[PDB]
């Protein structure tokens, strides 16, 4: 009763009387649990997340330059300098130039020349500091109650998990309980890394990479851009002039290098919640505390009718929908066998008992068929309902 | 006192030429930048040219190729080659230094008394 | 070629009055702008050099302000000694130019 | 001639009928010129000089630090900043210290630290570049007229020389004319060098040395000191705070290193005029236009006497002061000989005629006597005057 | 304890029933003391100092020269003398010059010449001798009371130790006492050395090094300077005169040479108090008089919470800050174990009992997880609080 | 818009103790440094204390052992513990902030409405 | 340890006219100087944060200037709301310090 | 007995020249240094020249070249020859000896009776 | 260049009165100062050749004291040879130079 078509849908079966089992989850997939006489369970990672990591640093992937200003000195007349050179904010560079009498100079030789321009970032990425203690895990769980597919969204459990709350317990109405026990200490190493964001798109990458970026960068809080001479370059001088080049938006180059970095996204609602893809974790669960809600109920042996016919799962099992038109808190027998003689239920009933809980509503059923040809069987007496199946 | 004083105003025929000039005193004149400006009739004030402390000129298209500045350390004298002169260029000219660093790109402090140039 | 102007044709003004002028350009100049004053029959004088700060001896009777495209000069408690012509001036691209002139007159 | 007094004479003798001879002059020494029938001529450097050479650089050798500032950040939370960083006037440095809860720090690890101080040079040397074309030489020239020592400073001729006033001549009353040429374009390499100036003391050193000096420097005027790195150093941070050393005045170190440099001095009469001590020049002289003033005169044969006795020089020659009393414009015989028989003038007369120009006035004589014993003889008859001499 | 903030920490563990332990102490670092059933003690070397050591020597690293005098004699007339020569305050030199008629002399040759100038020290460093008897240690020591980070400054015991004192112990309330026998007699060899004082900077230097310094020097009594020849120099005479040369301020050179010395520091509160930087001390410590104070109190696990969550120290143990608000004075348990099953307390507990001594206040705790990774516990039941750690 | 406002003022017995506080708003509180100043009954101002944005404290020798400044930046609550309060400590107290780089070396910016303190 | 002093002191002053107040320190404070004002009871506010540099919102009518060890504030024309007690404050040195303030009043 | 006796002072033509002299007595004259000094008619004393016991002369810049000392210690006589004489001087002249250590840098010991210049 | 300035010029005092006269020099003179008298119409006389040094035959009623830069005579009793002109003379620096002189009289 969950996990339609999931990219992996693997089974773990507990040893009988084993209070715990362990599982490793990856956000692509889910894992379903068999408990040898207790309702089957299933679990999956909705997300791992950080909220509002610290705004440590910004980097400009593009800038614009304006009002380039220049002056000069004849070779003997000391050395050129200009007000902006003494301050920042202007990415200044200075060098020697050839000059001669024909340039109006007093003498022939190396003069000196200085050039600077106001620098402003056009577009910038931002970086943010991960706190491991601010990591959250959010895990989905659902028990194979056979509830209507629509009801899954109101049935589904979710639990928060983090190092300060390493244990939690799910509860299921009449279906008992199960504890869950996430593992933080070896899941992820984000302490060595920044979150990085550009335009509604973001990645996680290690601090040392960010430190090594050739691009110019900015404090978390102020105006002093720090290394503009990586982005700007100056032509070799002509006799009294230099033209100064802004490199274009490095964005594509940068975004190409990040192509191997793990992707991250903002929430729509909390703009400061960052949700991280590619996450994986280990966890443990107490199986014992679950309950088979309706095993005592009346066996149907009656003319139920199908609502969605037996159809192949993404892997292995078959699924179907059925309801009872007139009945009770009731339960339905299910068998899968080589022959319509049905000598053994060769396959495994996955919802370990599909109780027809009410007159109101259909129930979902899931079965692992055997290899080769087999017959699906539901109900009892001459009133039983059946169809062919294979592997 | 820091001082400038213009010289070489007067009258000339159109298409003729003149030495506009000025004397500077009271400071290490070689280290400053120097600049020339005028007020025309119709009560407008207009830049005409400047030179760096490095002997290096800057010009508007109104005057580009007509004139040049020059100066000497020898006497702290400005010169301006009034040349190919044309009717609009009648004005009270002035010169007014520059800045401490020898930037042409600056405000400027002190103005000479100016002198009138006229053309028939 | 930066265009710029300040609007007033003149200010008629009186002893102890506060009066102002404001200038607007065609490009977001870096406050590399000055205001200049000329009483008649003698050369101009420069009051404020970078658009926020004065040269020596210019009295607290004057001040100025602005950013990017937009600038102003103010006079606090005017006197007749301050009358006459006024000009702005840009200087962060080489076609240096003064925009519109204006003047200050006694009422 | 004044060259009698100098600690070192070089002698050169012109070939008969030789229009020219050449000599090399160096400030601590002087030259005397002999020619077979021409009054002997002596020449010397007074000085070589530069006028108002242009400021290459200024260099500080002491500085004082004040208004010292600090700022810090908790280890993961960012990178420290301070407004004063953005202008060179504050001689910044940046570093890290560990911090932890003992520092009140909210987490354990390397906190970022920055610090600044207002820098001012206390005492600075200045440098100026050698315009080789601006070099001047001054040559002192004098003739062995035998004029009294008391008169030398009024008889002596001083000649200017300049890269573009390369020829000069001197005139001596009755003794005729002399003309001089010297290597103003070529005698020194010093365009490769700066004049070095401290308080009332100065040297000349090559540009490369000065440019290599590991000390903060300034150029033009008023601009920010461009190389704070060396004169200021900061301790390791301690107790999440820092304080800043300053190195001592390097003046002594610098003045020690200059011990190999050639020395320079200031004209008290002209703050722009620098005089360089230890230069040398190559020079050539026309002797031809000289003449021996008194040649036509008679001999006195009358009772002269010594005003000052025959006496040793610094140079193995000897000198005398003699006056004729009753007599005439007269040339007096002087002989150095083995015997009072005076068979041969064994040695060389240096003032090629001793002339008593008037009965009132002594005349000064130099001769180069032979090795070993000899007699000096002056005058004739029993009125002769004589003196024994040795080597 | 204050000691948590030290960057360099090491553990001494006493053998069981060792009533004494001992520790070696160094200003850069701290020691922590463990014993099987005792409150842990932290020990740190504080200031090592002298007050008013006696003046040994003063050295003028800069001086100025003025009133310069010269006198001279013609070579035959014997040796020259001067009035100002009569007293050492004028730092005289005597030599010989050329003289001759060319400088007005009566005879050519070497003549006696003499010069003087009053000599004054401009700036001087001073030296002061180490009385080992006057060496005063201060030492900081504090028990792991689990006191709040802030209260460290007030619980801390500061004790002074010197060559006149064996132990001067103190008591910790309820935790009992520890005696402290410091190695006041033995820890340093400085009797062979001076404290060197420059302007607001100082060093310790051996007497030989200092006495070997060539700069001119003066007794601690301030007697007239002894050796000005090493600061003052003289040109070879020109025939008229000698120029006298002052060498520059040497402090830059000397402060360079001092770079190998241990640094020393002035106190502003008493200008005669000098503090030695980086010293060593050791001490013998009694632990048996210590007490675990809290054993009387209960265990309640009564809805405790973190005031500040667990975190790693600078030194690989982990710490946390916690309160039981309301509740009662209580001593809640702490363990680190292999698993959430918590089979073995595989790592070491570093402070043994908390004391929730008043219902409004927090406690600080420290633990030492085992190598690899391990799980931390405080409190009991499902209501217990937990986290995860590496080695 | 930013606002600071004081709390915890009033009266205590001499030698007694308090913990003053401020709530502050409108800025990323971690980034600023903050400080306290007295207006005395003499109506003479005085500096009390400051803390860096790097969470480091500063005091004058008038109170080196007496006050303690502190803040919680996550809750952006600022605190000022005090003890030994003497007669001369009776004054108006205001808190204030520095700048966005937040060294204590800063021209202080905005001040709270203040709260008084007294002893009797 | 720095101290500061004002040569002026609490006074009446010619409302509407320009007004001046002046301070000196123990030493050079490198223009780490701020000026501030109070009206009785209500909390003080800042005016000048370095010599010749101003907040937003503070009136351009003020300016103060100086260098090294001594400095002065002016207003180029006074206002009834703006006459009050004025204080100056250096903030370079380790213990910060205030210069004793000057009141302004007129009938 | 230290009697010292000047001679030769008198009238001279402007631009002319003169040689002054003085006779010493009563001490081993060679050992001492000596000086010449002029009492201005408005009573300003002024140093003229000095001479070392090593015959090293000294002069103020005001008479460089124009004046010179010489001495004859075979006869204990001082000479002062001078040229280009100018009515800037018409003083009484005196001379004096220095230290028995014999150096220019001495106070004056004793002065002669003097003789006066005049120029016309 | 060196300059001297003796402080009085024209004092009068009684026969046997006590008087101090004093001079400051333009820089250090390190007590290479002398004090001299001209009795009118006759050749000068030497009094003190460094401060704290009586010249030979000068009576003990003359005295004087000094410093780096400022110096004085004191006369304990102006006996009748007092009448005349008194001069200081520096001799540390080779352009030797004199005070103005100063007169004394009875009438």
Residue numbers in the entry:
A (entry chain C), D (entry chain B), E (entry chain A): 1 to 391
B (entry chain H), F (entry chain F), H (entry chain D): 1 to 120
C (entry chain I), G (entry chain G), I (entry chain E): 1 to 107
Give the exact sentences the study uses for this entry:
Yellow fever virus (YFV) is a re-emerging flavivirus that causes severe hepatic disease and mortality in humans. Crystallographic studies have resolved the structure of the YFV E protein and shown that its domain architecture is similar to related flaviviruses, with three N-terminal ectodomains, known as domains I (DI), II (DII) and III (DIII) and a stem anchor region known as the transmembrane domain (TM). Here we use a chimeric virus platform to resolve the first high resolution cryo-EM structures of YFV. Stark differences in particle morphology and homogeneity are observed between vaccine and virulent strains of YFV, and these are found to have significant implications on antibody recognition and neutralisation.
To directly compare the structures of bYFV17D and bYFVES504/DIII17D, we resolved the structure of bYFVES504/DIII17D complexed with Fab 2C9 to a resolution of 8.1 Å. 2C9 Fab occupies all 180 sites on the surface of bYFVES504/DIII17D. Next, we used the symmetry expanded local reconstruction method to resolve the bYFVES504/DIII17D:2C9 ASU structure to 3.6 Å. Similar to the bYFVES504/DIII17D ASU structure, the bYFVES504/DIII17D:2C9 ASU map is not well defined at the icosahedral three-fold axis. An atomic model of the bYFVES504/DIII17D:2C9 ASU was then built and compared to the bYFV17D:2C9 ASU atomic model. Both models were very similar, with minor discrepancies in several of the surface loops as well as with the position of DIII (Cα RMSD: 1.25 Å). Exchange with DIII of YFV17D allowed for high resolution elucidation of the bYFVES504 virion structure in both unbound and 2C9 (E-DII mAb) bound forms, demonstrating high similarity to bYFV17D.
